[PDB]
Design a binder for this molecule. Structure first.
Ligand SMILES: Nc1ncnc2c1ncn2[C@@H]1O[C@H](CO)[C@@H](O)[C@H]1O
Ligand SMILES: Nc1ncnc2c1ncn2[C@@H]1O[C@H](CO)[C@@H](O)[C@H]1O
Ligand SMILES: [Ca+2]
Ligand SMILES: [Ca+2]
Ligand SMILES: [Cl-]
Ligand SMILES: [Cl-]
Ligand SMILES: [Zn+2]
Ligand SMILES: [Zn+2]
Lengths: 524, 524
């Protein structure tokens, strides 16, 4: 039998540097994980041990940290080139800066093929982008050939900014004729590599005849066999074996997100390209694997521009930005409003999945806000100013909560009001009124939440049994500040973008901000 | 004596096409005024009649209409070249797209000198922008030479986006050594051409010794001798003669704004370059002057790209945008909120003077909002969609009003509530509560307005004798919809940017909008 090792990443989301275990900034330098330098170490070791190896990425390298804000994809081409990826599928985030932001930094500089069979170009763009991404690629591997076909979420127009000259076709209908072309070319080992989410990956394994293995992304799905090595709870075994409509066992794999795991799948094929066994598990890239010094030296070199960005003017304020603890731990503060508005706006512009692309409610612990920003002089705000406001190195995560849970979180927000501690919440898309003369646990007297999805979009009373989607710091999603009910009762929690980056890009895009105290939080 | 005719424009604000008498879109094609084609006719006629003629622009050609949104300054270089301007001073709006947006479209393409003596470049920019604008230029005119020195408002960093590598120095201190250089060169006829406002222009005429004539802008100042030909009321005679500290009569001139007038000043000089007389008046460019057909043919040709922009996707909405009359003439509607938020945000980003750069209150007649925009499909908003919402061809103007005036405007808003007419106001930066059970004229029971300039920026009760600055349609500033108290009582009214353009660029910059009904207007 001929054995192929597939190494794969997906939804790296600009985590070029090593991170903490939850994908936020690495605070404890000896428990960090992921990053491209550590990835390279582990990939090089397997390439030395195994004769036939492919390294694939299933999309969403773009977006998430200062690396993408400053380098805009040039860092993705440079470091994926340095790692010698064999192919990549386009994900939705690859369109976040429009087709122009995809063609220049990435499609023109990458030294490997970039694939998607279901994106059709038209008008003027068609001979402009022509051949810059491919529906399939035949790759030699050792003494054999493997074909790779790409696909990208049809939800891309609602998530990103691909423009009106690209059509996203149904994946299975677009994939079948390309796999048929590979079969006509006598390629008998075919990987479908793409970015549509685990549900669609399972449907492709079942329905696209000729596909031997599916390597996917988009849904941040973690699969693992046996006792998992970190906090992620697996959605199924790895590989997740799906039997096809033509009765073959098709391994389906994904490797969570954020470059925290390297997916590692070994497949044995018979002489006719049928899979006769498959086994593996994602490898946790934790600090027991050293960062490769030649990649890390390049990371250090590229970081100099990022460190320089710290003093650059992002925008201006026309108001004093009151991030003092005497304000933000006690009442509505306009710095809290600004940060919640940024959290919302960034996720609406750049959402990771449709499930989250209408989120319009935000809570933020006031103890998370650590400095004011004065408008004298000229009102200039820089990254360095924001880093003093948000110094903890966190992310702004997405959670789905029952109303009863959120009501308990607002009771917790004032249960010991007056003690100057950090759990008092600033909000966006929420109007709350407290009556502090009432018993702890019964101080919320009105709690109305923005409803975006409906007749006349508006604030409506929170309902205990309805479910709501909220953006908030990772620190609160994990139950910090005593918000144990959030951690214990939430229905879904996805990690999101790095925090200072999110606020800096919001100010960059607004240019002039004027947040004000406007009645989001009242006391009666 | 040697006689020089100075023709001059300032604060054209992207009004390349002819306009209505108030600078908004030309609706009645036979009462239109201004535009570059008509300007060219009148300038060519004077060039044929007079031997020594200079055509100067004192700044703020950038910004104001779709022409600048689509062409970003290339239209300014092209048409000022076609008119054969002899020189231009930089104004604040020339920095609205940053130094990069100034260097490429304008400084590199202009065929005339672009001047400013008080802008100093440093760091990397210094040898990059070097020589692309000049502190002075010596120009031959007929058989003599005239020197021109430029200057630009020190308020530019607070109005625009010139970056932190440009320093704006005090104008009189920067101008004096450059005028001294011209004197050393034996130039004895010196025009100071610049963009700092009439107050500063008068101080330059008094204090910069050697300046013969000041040609200014920025403050949209209209000067005229005798009975004025249109609606503008003159601030003084034209020219406005200032005696200098060295006892010379220095004509100071400006020509309003929007290309509506061509300034026309004749100066006689003795052999030593002393002004021995000066006379003139701005010429109203009204429809008695034909549009020049060679310039208009080019305007038509360049318009094709603008007409094409009408179908281009600007951004997306995630909410139904309710611009129906049943909503917007009766209660808060999220289309009204969106348009007021756009009006505010655009003017904060791109304000014409410091006087207006903190405006954070907006009123908008609900009868001005003429269509909803559905989110199906994909939520795409185009210029054409917005043109259906805002079809009247107006501008969003700046007014300063006493509180008592604004309170009367809110009483007018509901004085015959229920009759479905268009005077009901949508708002931004204002919370109003009405009690419709009370007498007409006494229905406003709460009226709180955002105060940006203060301790903890916030909504505070309107005070009858305080003065407030508000952005609103030209149609309301001129007393439309029965708001005669606004027209009759306002303290200052400046025309602003064209309306669909303002909303389109706001959506372009926000990318995804989600306006909602949030309690700006309540009934008790
Ligand atoms: N990782 C973190 N992210 C956000 N806020 C934090 C974090 N750690 C501590 N805080 C805030 O700092 C306060 C203590 O100064 C806490 O009550 C909490 O509100
Ligand atoms: N030039 C204009 N600008 C804005 N709104 C207008 C204009 N002309 C008419 N309207 C609105 O149209 C309504 C009549 O349909 C008027 O009551 C007024 O609210
Ligand atoms: Ca096969
Ligand atoms: Ca002189
Ligand atoms: Cl999925
Ligand atoms: Cl002035
Ligand atoms: Zn994705
Ligand atoms: Zn100006």
């Amino acid at each position: 039998p001929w054995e192929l090792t597939i190494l794969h990443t997906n939804d790296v989301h600009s985590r070029l540097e090593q991170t903490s275990e939850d994908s936020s900034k690495c605070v404890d330098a000896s428990r960090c994980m992921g990053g491209v330098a550590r990835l390279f170490t582990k990939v090089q070791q397997i390439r030395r041990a195994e004769p036939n190896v492919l390294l694939l990425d299933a999309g969403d390298q773009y977006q998430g940290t200062i690396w993408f804000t400053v380098y805009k994809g040039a860092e993705v081409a440079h470091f994926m080139n340095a790692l010698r990826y064999d192919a990549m599928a386009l994900g939705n985030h690859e369109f976040d800066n429009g087709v122009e932001g995809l063609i220049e930094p990435l499609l023109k500089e990458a030294k490997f093929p970039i694939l998607s069979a279901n994106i059709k170009a038209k008008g003027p763009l068609a001979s402009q982008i022509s051949g810059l991404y491919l529906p399939y690629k035949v790759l030699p591997v050792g003494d054999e050939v493997v074909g790779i076909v790409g696909y990208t979420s049809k939800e891309t127009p609602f998530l990103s900014n691909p423009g009106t000259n690209l059509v996203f076709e149904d994946e299975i209908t677009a994939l079948q004729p390309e796999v048929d072309k590979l079969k006509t070319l006598n390629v008998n080992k075919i990987i479908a590599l793409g970015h549509s989410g685990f549900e669609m990956d399972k449907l492709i394994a079942q329905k696209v005849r000729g596909v031997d293995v599916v390597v996917g992304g988009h849904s941040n799905t973690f699969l693992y066999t046996g006792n998992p090595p970190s906090k992620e709870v697996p959605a199924g075994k790895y590989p997740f074996i799906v039997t096809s409509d033509d009765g073959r066992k098709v391994p389906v794999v994904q490797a969570y997100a954020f470059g925290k795991y390297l997916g590692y799948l070994k497949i044995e094929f018979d002489e006719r390209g049928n899979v006769i066994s498959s086994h593996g598990n994602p490898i946790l890239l934790d600090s027991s694997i050293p960062e490769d010094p030649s990649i890390k030296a390049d990371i250090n070199k590229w970081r100099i521009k990022l460190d320089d960005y710290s003093t650059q003017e992002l925008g201006k304020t026309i108001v004093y930005l009151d991030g003092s603890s005497q304000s933000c731990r006690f009442r509505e503060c306009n710095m809290g409003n600004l940060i919640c508005d940024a959290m919302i706006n960034n996720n609406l512009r750049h959402a990771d999945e449709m499930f989250w692309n209408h989120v319009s409610m935000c809570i933020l612990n006031g103890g998370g806000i650590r400095s004011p920003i004065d408008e004298r002089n000229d009102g200039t705000i820089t990254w360095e100013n924001l880093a003093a406001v948000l110094p903890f190195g966190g992310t702004f995560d997405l959670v789905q909560l029952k109303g009863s849970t959120l009501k308990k979180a607002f009771e917790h927000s004032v249960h010991r009001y007056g003690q100057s501690t950090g759990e008092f919440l600033q909000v966006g898309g929420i109007h709350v009124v407290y009556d502090l003369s009432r018993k702890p646990g019964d101080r919320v007297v009105k709690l109305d939440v923005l409803c975006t999805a409906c007749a006349v979009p508006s604030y409506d009373p929170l309902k205990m049994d309805e479910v709501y989607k909220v953006i908030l710091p990772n620190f609160l999603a994990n139950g910090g500040d005593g918000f144990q009910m959030i951690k214990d009762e939430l229905l879904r929690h996805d990690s999101g973008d790095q925090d200072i980056n999110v606020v800096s890009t919001y100010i960059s895009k607004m240019k002039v901000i004027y947040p004000a105290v406007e009645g989001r939080i009242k006391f009666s």
